[PDB]
């Protein structure tokens, strides 16, 4: 079941990465307009955090409602259950989930991927996008059995 | 336990889809035409969800373009035994058209379905009934694989 859970998330992340890549390289729109559009889409997922990094490795944008996920990417553990690799496990940060009162499932465990995105300057992608998807529901199911 | 867990995964996704589309269809600043245009723009982007919107008389006003109207499969709907509470159904159709071929092609013909009243009120009753169907084929592929 662990490999199945990894495949579920990888499918989701593949789709999310395609959507956000297209957003960040949408023709005839400024950076401001693209980041506004991206934030609205990311907010719509409700179980996703992102961070956008420049060529030096400085964060130009990250999602509200949580600390920058780049503060947890350097101690990310490679995911053993992801065949093909390039998927990482994050032990934080905790994401705020308002609107439901007390007892909502905690979102502080993630599967992470990253890819080059954004307009080319020149022929070369300016940004690197980090995408984190909550895996806490997976981890609670596994922990509750044992 | 894993079947019940798969149901709860789906129910959670359906809850969020329900809340998003509910806001869209009774958004205070917009006309009914603008709201439906917003619905269609959002819904067309879905990879694994079909929806159908019925009017006051139970006639379909809108449904997703990738497949036949899911309300045509209401007559074959089975209560979801793994959904322990509420009104969740299992549909064994329709097939949703998906892009690509080979290993990359997504086979989507099995659904968990819910419905709710939606839209602005007329005579103290919402004008629409929204039907939402989420793909469960990946759940079934896993279970059928274990059974050999
Ligand atoms: Ag969250
Ligand atoms: Ag899970
Ligand atoms: Ag589909
Ligand atoms: Ag599954």
DSSP B122-137: ETTEEEEEEEEEEE-H
Give the residue among B85, B65, B84, B144 at the shortest CA–CA distance from B110: B144
Using a CB-CB cut-off of 8 Å, the residues of chain A touching B19 are none
Cα–Cα distances (Å) from B15 to A43, A49, B131, in that order, read 15, 20, 12
Count helices and strands in chain B by DSSP H and E runs:
3, 6
> Is A141–B5 a contact, with Cβ atoms under 8 angstroms apart?
yes
Chosen from A45, A140, A141 to mutate, greatest number of chain B CBs within 10 A: A141
Q: What would the two tokens of residue A116 be?
A: 């080059």
Selected residues 41-60 of chain B with any CB under 8 Å from a CB in chain A: 47
Q: Which residue has the tokens 């990250």?
A: A62
Using a CB-CB cut-off of 8 Å, the residues of chain A touching B12 are 137
The CA-based angle B29-B35-B37, given to 5 degrees, is: 135
Q: What would the two tokens of residue B108 be?
A: 């989507």
Pairing of strands A110-120, A88-90: antiparallel
| Residues in contact with B57: Cβ distance below 8 Å, sequence separation at least 6, in sequence order | none
Quote the CA–CA distance of B3 and A38 in Å, as a whole number. 34
DSSP type of residue A83: T
- Give strand ranges (E) for B47-146: 49-54, 60-63, 78-79, 89-91, 111-122, 125-135
| Cα radius of gyration rounded to whole Å, chain B | 16
Quote the CA–CA distance of A74 and B70 in Å, as a whole number. 46
Instruction: Give the domain ranges of chain B.
Output: 1-148
| Cα radius of gyration rounded to whole Å, chain A | 16
Contact A68, A62 (CB under 8 A): yes
B140 exposed, middle or buried (CB, 10 Å; 0-12, 13-18, 19+)?
middle
> Is B9–A137 a contact, with Cβ atoms under 8 angstroms apart?
yes
Q: Beta partners for A141?
A: none
> Is B12–A137 a contact, with Cβ atoms under 8 angstroms apart?
yes
């Amino acid at each position: 079941v662990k490999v199945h859970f990894a495949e579920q998330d990888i499918n989701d992340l593949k789709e999310i990465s395609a959507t956000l890549e297209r957003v960040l390289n949408h023709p005839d729109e400024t950076q401001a307009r693209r980041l506004m559009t991206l934030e609205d889409i990311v907010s719509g997922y409700s179980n996703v955090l992102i961070s956008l990094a420049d060529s030096q490795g400085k964060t130009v944008y990250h999602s509200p409602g949580a600390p920058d996920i780049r503060e947890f990417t350097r101690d990310a553990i490679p995911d053993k259950d992801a065949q093909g690799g390039e998927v990482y496990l994050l032990s934080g940060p905790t994401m705020m989930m308002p609107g439901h009162g007390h007892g909502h499932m905690e979102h502080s465990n993630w599967r992470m991927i990253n890819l080059p995105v954004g307009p080319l300057v020149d022929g070369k992608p300016i940004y690197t996008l980090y995408i984190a998807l909550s895996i806490d529901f997976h981890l609670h199911y596994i922990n509750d059995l044992m």
